[PDB]
Amino acid sequence: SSRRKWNKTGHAVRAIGRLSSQPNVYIKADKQKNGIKANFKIRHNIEDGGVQLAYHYQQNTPIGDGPVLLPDNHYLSVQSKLSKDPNEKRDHMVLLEFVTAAGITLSKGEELFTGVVPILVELDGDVNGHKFSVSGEGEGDATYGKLTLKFICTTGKLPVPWPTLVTTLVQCFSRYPDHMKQHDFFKSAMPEGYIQERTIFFKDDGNYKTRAEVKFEGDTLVNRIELKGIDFKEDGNILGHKLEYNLPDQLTEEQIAEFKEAFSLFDKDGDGTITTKELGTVMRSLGQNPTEAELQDMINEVDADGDGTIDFPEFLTMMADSEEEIREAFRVFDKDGNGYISAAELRHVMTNLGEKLTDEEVDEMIREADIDGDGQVNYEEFVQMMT
Amino acid sequence: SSRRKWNKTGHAVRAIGRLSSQPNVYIKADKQKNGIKANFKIRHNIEDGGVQLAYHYQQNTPIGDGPVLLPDNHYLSVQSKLSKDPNEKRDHMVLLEFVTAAGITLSKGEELFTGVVPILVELDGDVNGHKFSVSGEGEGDATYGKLTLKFICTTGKLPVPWPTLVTTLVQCFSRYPDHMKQHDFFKSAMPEGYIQERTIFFKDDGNYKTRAEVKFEGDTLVNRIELKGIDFKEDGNILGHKLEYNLPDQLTEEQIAEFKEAFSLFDKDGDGTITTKELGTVMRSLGQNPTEAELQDMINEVDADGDGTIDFPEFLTMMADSEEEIREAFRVFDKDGNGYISAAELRHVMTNLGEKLTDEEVDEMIREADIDGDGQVNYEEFVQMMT
Ligand SMILES: [Ca+2]
Ligand SMILES: [Ca+2]
Ligand SMILES: [Ca+2]
Ligand SMILES: [Ca+2]
Ligand SMILES: [Ca+2]
Ligand SMILES: [Ca+2]
Ligand SMILES: [Ca+2]
Ligand SMILES: [Ca+2]
């Protein structure tokens, strides 16, 4: 009864917690300056408990005098994975990010971002007078909203935590879906580029002020940054390195890469999106017959932006009970339903998915799974292979 | 490499599995008969592994000659919880269901369903000549899309599994959101009601054919059903009782009920939906200041139907890392941030949520949590109380 009031009330307070837990980047036009502004919070986990808030204010304005696209209000949704290179002796960060635009219901610069673009990042910083520099290199693939980079502190040890520098260290690699392409300021500014400025307030601590130039130099997208940090506490969360480096129990880069390859089999036109047409094609080639309504409801189920298609980050979320999943997978492979996957059936399944492999490569797949040497893959063999 | 091909391919097949895993009820108009049709599959878990498919074809036509609403294409999404009454010696089923309409983008009979409506269900069946009867009683609350019923076999032992009878045993209790109210055939037919007919094919087994009359008799919504089952196998999944009764590890009815009470504190107008206005009000009363964009993005995050508001089933899904959640909950209660929740602060938090309690009831809440007898609730006390 008292316990029921605590529960009731606690559920409500935890609900506001759960709802506020994953703040997106809120973008708005700035007509006056021919650009945009953005406002958002970042919650950095504190080692051993709690969150350090970082309140971001941002403005971007074009570098050139050309025309740009000035967007309606929308947001960007970001997923970030931080890691370490075990062979790297310098202070560093490996970063993987997926960013997609959303929040509007239902071509200048686009051509620069259709494939993989090399990226260079240079940062010179001063935090409480501690001078430092960072340089990073990698690739962006705006089709998947994907950025992959490795960063090095080129002045020795970073005097602030790596996670605090992530937002500072190329929003032109965000995936805007088709209906929102007219709201992509970032690409419209290219190749001449844009200036990005922010102030970032760390609750109960200091602030960063940054200015950056983001432009192409040849075929490379370059982000060159000046950062000044003031008013930080010597034993606070930033200067004290009390923030958690990476989120626990995320997927491996290698697992993500296998999911991307899997996504490819569906996205036959390579535009970074799975439509009902494409999902249907694959399902039908497998011997299944969804209706249009079933195909649509299937997509809706995982359609976070509500565009009617599955983009890669949405697919990754779904792929990120197990026994029953593996058993149903087995039936799809075992086309005639006799309890054995034959080399022929596997050949056919590969063709059905659009997976081009020689007959010898297929034989090697069976051989890897085929414990009892009958040249076929039974259910128990399939489970060992799948787990 | 062979392993990578298996993984790649397996991920794709499992993805079609995950996507197809929760089929909704697809509804379409039937202009000719002044009614609707529906098509959907039910996957029943087989004890010890696998799924028994049940392919449903449905048609409804009005009982009276009055006008009805003939809908555009849409669907219903259903969550079901089956349980047992430990005191009941008769063969029975306790059923809790939430049903909401979706799949259209962006008043006759409505007035009958604004509060809680008592329900009576009567079924007479013949399966492979085995005669049986079922009678059930409970309540529906269409505001939350909620049905709660208890069913008894009144002829002795049920010759088929309880889960196979769920779809047969009142879609007028579905929650249609505001923008879709003109597509609610089921309520528009009331009080005179409708006839519902289905054929249900159990893959590799027999079929059921049902006919039902659904209407008000006085203030009670009555579902009276005739079921005929033919062609079932004596040792198949149905006549053999080889289907799993209930899904494992669902919430208790008592937990759901505490979540509903929590939902109430937000839904101040009691219409079954939380708007950004209402979420804002509560958050602000707590000392928080979301912007409109933050409030909207918060809702979007859990908005499965894409209507812009949180209905109860959407809230339940969110409420259905823990340490960090409890720590952030503590800070909301501990308004001045001194490490102790005072009786005053708890009083204020109750008022902030719209939770009406006497000062004595609040004192009893502290007393229940207050292990060390200082009249306040510290963090460790709060964790013990919350877990
Ligand atoms: Ca595509
Ligand atoms: Ca989508
Ligand atoms: Ca086979
Ligand atoms: Ca074998
Ligand atoms: Ca409301
Ligand atoms: Ca909603
Ligand atoms: Ca306090
Ligand atoms: Ca105490």
Side-chain angles (χ1 to χ4, degrees):
Chain A
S1 180
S2 290
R3 192 193 159 258
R4 172 134 131 279
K5 291 165 201 324
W6 273 116
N7 297 158
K8 169 175 191 179
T9 305
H11 295 334
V13 170
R14 290 187 303 113
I16 289 160
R18 289 192 183 192
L19 290 165
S20 307
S21 232
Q22 286 201 335
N24 288 315
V25 178
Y26 303 98
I27 295 176
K28 71 182 164 215
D30 184 358
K31 299 65 145 43
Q32 319 295 52
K33 299 227 181 136
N34 203 24
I36 62 156
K37 284 169 135 198
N39 297 94
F40 56 101
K41 312 167 158 52
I42 297 293
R43 308 169 91 262
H44 302 287
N45 293 336
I46 296 170
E47 282 282 60
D48 285 4
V51 153
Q52 170 66 67
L53 268 160
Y55 303 103
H56 288 60
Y57 297 78
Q58 181 178 331
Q59 52 195 131
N60 303 60
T61 56
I63 288 181
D65 304 315
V68 300
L69 297 165
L70 292 182
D72 286 340
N73 293 9
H74 63 284
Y75 58 86
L76 305 176
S77 160
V78 174
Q79 306 121 94
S80 283
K81 174 185 168 69
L82 277 64
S83 60
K84 295 291 186 183
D85 181 345
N87 293 297
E88 178 58 65
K89 285 90 112 182
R90 291 168 301 169
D91 196 4
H92 74 284
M93 165 173 77
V94 184
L95 182 59
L96 172 65
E97 200 151 84
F98 294 96
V99 178
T100 55
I104 286 162
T105 172
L106 279 135
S107 81
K108 169 170 201 316
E110 208 68 51
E111 53 306 316
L112 298 165
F113 292 97
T114 54
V116 177
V117 177
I119 304 171
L120 173 71
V121 179
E122 290 187 324
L123 176 156
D124 289 336
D126 184 329
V127 174
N128 279 32
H130 294 279
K131 294 304 218 254
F132 67 93
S133 281
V134 168
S135 113
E137 284 178 31
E139 274 163 20
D141 197 357
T143 297
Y144 303 97
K146 177 179 164 207
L147 290 171
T148 186
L149 287 107
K150 176 173 155 168
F151 296 95
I152 298 295
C153 181
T154 51
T155 49
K157 175 146 166 50
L158 206 60
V160 298
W162 279 112
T164 72
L165 294 183
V166 168
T167 56
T168 301
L169 291 170
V170 289
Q171 291 172 302
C172 49
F173 293 105
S174 309
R175 187 197 162 71
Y176 278 69
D178 271 1
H179 81 287
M180 284 188 62
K181 294 284 201 187
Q182 76 271 44
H183 301 296
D184 192 350
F185 164 88
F186 305 107
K187 291 181 190 66
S188 79
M190 297 290 168
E192 297 85 356
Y194 59 75
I195 301 293
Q196 179 161 299
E197 286 170 292
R198 300 205 179 94
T199 299
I200 298 167
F201 298 101
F202 295 91
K203 182 77 184 290
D204 299 311
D205 220 328
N207 67 75
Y208 295 157
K209 288 202 177 67
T210 66
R211 190 180 176 279
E213 281 164 27
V214 182
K215 52 177 176 115
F216 279 87
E217 299 187 325
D219 298 284
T220 300
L221 185 285
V222 179
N223 183 22
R224 280 203 193 86
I225 313 153
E226 279 218 8
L227 181 150
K228 170 94 153 144
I230 69 177
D231 296 345
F232 286 88
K233 292 167 182 320
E234 163 157 3
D235 75 341
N237 297 327
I238 287 58
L239 293 185
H241 293 272
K242 314 196 182 167
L243 295 180
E244 174 188 68
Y245 175 75
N246 74 295
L247 291 178
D249 311 338
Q250 304 188 281
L251 293 173
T252 310
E253 285 201 14
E254 91 106 290
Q255 280 175 293
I256 294 166
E258 297 183 332
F259 291 126
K260 189 160 173 286
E261 289 202 322
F263 181 86
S264 273
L265 299 171
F266 296 96
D267 185 14
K268 309 281 188 200
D269 66 4
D271 74 348
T273 208
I274 301 169
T275 62
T276 60
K277 194 138 171 153
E278 292 168 320
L279 179 59
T281 305
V282 172
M283 286 184 71
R284 282 192 301 262
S285 286
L286 287 174
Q288 300 182 3
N289 298 102
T291 173
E292 175 190 66
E294 287 165 322
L295 284 168
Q296 195 76 69
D297 177 58
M298 287 178 198
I299 293 200
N300 293 350
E301 192 69 3
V302 305
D303 193 13
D305 59 346
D307 82 331
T309 78
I310 305 161
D311 61 31
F312 179 61
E314 288 161 348
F315 179 95
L316 199 44
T317 299
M318 168 187 66
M319 297 308 300
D321 269 349
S322 278
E323 302 167 354
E324 190 50 43
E325 175 158 277
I326 292 166
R327 177 187 336 264
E328 294 298 316
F330 185 84
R331 313 203 100 160
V332 165
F333 285 82
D334 170 28
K335 283 150 97 69
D336 63 14
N338 82 332
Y340 301 83
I341 298 158
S342 64
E345 290 172 329
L346 186 63
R347 280 191 311 263
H348 299 150
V349 176
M350 294 309 256
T351 305
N352 287 162
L353 295 169
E355 226 323 272
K356 187 172 196 166
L357 284 183
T358 60
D359 293 354
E360 288 85 355
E361 279 174 316
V362 173
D363 282 338
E364 274 296 309
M365 286 180 71
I366 300 283
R367 167 198 183 212
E368 231 253 10
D370 176 24
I371 296 168
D372 62 5
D374 69 351
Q376 301 197 40
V377 180
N378 64 28
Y379 177 66
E380 169 162 69
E381 285 166 342
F382 181 76
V383 178
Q384 284 188 36
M385 194 78 347
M386 284 291 102
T387 64
Chain B
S1 180
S2 290
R3 192 193 159 258
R4 172 134 131 279
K5 291 165 201 324
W6 273 116
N7 297 158
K8 169 175 191 179
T9 305
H11 295 334
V13 170
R14 290 187 303 113
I16 289 160
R18 289 192 183 192
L19 290 165
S20 307
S21 232
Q22 286 201 335
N24 288 315
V25 178
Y26 303 98
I27 295 176
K28 71 182 164 215
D30 184 358
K31 299 65 145 43
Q32 319 295 52
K33 299 227 181 136
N34 203 24
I36 62 156
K37 284 169 135 198
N39 297 94
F40 56 101
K41 312 167 158 52
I42 297 293
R43 308 169 91 262
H44 302 287
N45 293 336
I46 296 170
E47 282 282 60
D48 285 4
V51 153
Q52 170 66 67
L53 268 160
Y55 303 103
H56 288 60
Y57 297 78
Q58 181 178 331
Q59 52 195 131
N60 303 60
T61 56
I63 288 181
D65 304 315
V68 300
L69 297 165
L70 292 182
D72 286 340
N73 293 9
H74 63 284
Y75 58 86
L76 305 176
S77 160
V78 174
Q79 306 121 94
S80 283
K81 174 185 168 69
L82 277 64
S83 60
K84 295 291 186 183
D85 181 345
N87 293 297
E88 178 58 65
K89 285 90 112 182
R90 291 168 301 169
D91 196 4
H92 74 284
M93 165 173 77
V94 184
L95 182 59
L96 172 65
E97 200 151 84
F98 294 96
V99 178
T100 55
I104 286 162
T105 172
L106 279 135
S107 81
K108 169 170 201 316
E110 208 68 51
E111 53 306 316
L112 298 165
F113 292 97
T114 54
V116 177
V117 177
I119 304 171
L120 173 71
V121 179
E122 290 187 324
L123 176 156
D124 289 336
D126 184 329
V127 174
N128 279 32
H130 294 279
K131 294 304 218 254
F132 67 93
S133 281
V134 168
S135 113
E137 284 178 31
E139 274 163 20
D141 197 357
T143 297
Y144 303 97
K146 177 179 164 207
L147 290 171
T148 186
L149 287 107
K150 176 173 155 168
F151 296 95
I152 298 295
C153 181
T154 51
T155 49
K157 175 146 166 50
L158 206 60
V160 298
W162 279 112
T164 72
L165 294 183
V166 168
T167 56
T168 301
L169 291 170
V170 289
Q171 291 172 302
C172 49
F173 293 105
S174 309
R175 187 197 162 71
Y176 278 69
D178 271 1
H179 81 287
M180 284 188 62
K181 294 284 201 187
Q182 76 271 44
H183 301 296
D184 192 350
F185 164 88
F186 305 107
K187 291 181 190 66
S188 79
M190 297 290 168
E192 297 85 356
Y194 59 75
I195 301 293
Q196 179 161 299
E197 286 170 292
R198 300 205 179 94
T199 299
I200 298 167
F201 298 101
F202 295 91
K203 182 77 184 290
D204 299 311
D205 220 328
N207 67 75
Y208 295 157
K209 288 202 177 67
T210 66
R211 190 180 176 279
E213 281 164 27
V214 182
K215 52 177 176 114
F216 279 87
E217 299 187 325
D219 298 284
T220 300
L221 185 285
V222 179
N223 183 22
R224 280 203 193 86
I225 313 153
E226 279 218 8
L227 181 150
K228 170 94 153 144
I230 69 177
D231 296 345
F232 286 88
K233 292 167 182 320
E234 163 157 3
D235 75 341
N237 297 327
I238 287 58
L239 293 185
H241 293 272
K242 314 196 182 167
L243 295 180
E244 174 188 68
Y245 175 75
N246 74 295
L247 291 178
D249 311 338
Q250 304 188 281
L251 293 173
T252 310
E253 285 201 14
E254 91 106 290
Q255 280 175 293
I256 294 166
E258 297 183 332
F259 291 126
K260 189 160 173 286
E261 289 202 322
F263 181 86
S264 273
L265 299 171
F266 296 96
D267 185 14
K268 309 281 188 200
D269 66 4
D271 74 348
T273 208
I274 301 169
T275 62
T276 60
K277 194 138 171 153
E278 292 168 320
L279 179 59
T281 305
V282 172
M283 286 184 71
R284 282 192 301 262
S285 286
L286 287 174
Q288 300 182 3
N289 298 102
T291 173
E292 175 190 66
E294 287 165 322
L295 284 168
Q296 195 76 69
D297 177 58
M298 287 178 198
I299 293 200
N300 293 350
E301 192 69 3
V302 305
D303 193 13
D305 59 346
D307 82 331
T309 78
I310 305 161
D311 61 31
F312 179 61
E314 288 161 348
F315 179 95
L316 199 44
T317 299
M318 168 187 66
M319 297 308 300
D321 269 349
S322 278
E323 302 167 354
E324 190 50 43
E325 175 158 277
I326 292 166
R327 177 187 336 264
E328 294 298 316
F330 185 84
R331 313 203 100 160
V332 165
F333 285 82
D334 170 28
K335 283 150 97 69
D336 63 14
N338 82 332
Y340 301 83
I341 298 158
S342 64
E345 290 172 329
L346 186 63
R347 280 191 311 263
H348 299 150
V349 176
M350 294 309 256
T351 305
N352 287 162
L353 295 169
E355 226 323 272
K356 187 172 196 166
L357 284 183
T358 60
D359 293 354
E360 288 85 355
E361 279 174 316
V362 173
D363 282 338
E364 274 296 309
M365 286 180 71
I366 300 283
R367 167 198 183 212
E368 231 253 10
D370 176 24
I371 296 168
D372 62 5
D374 69 351
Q376 301 197 40
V377 180
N378 64 28
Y379 177 66
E380 169 162 69
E381 285 166 342
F382 181 76
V383 178
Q384 284 188 36
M385 194 78 347
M386 284 291 102
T387 64

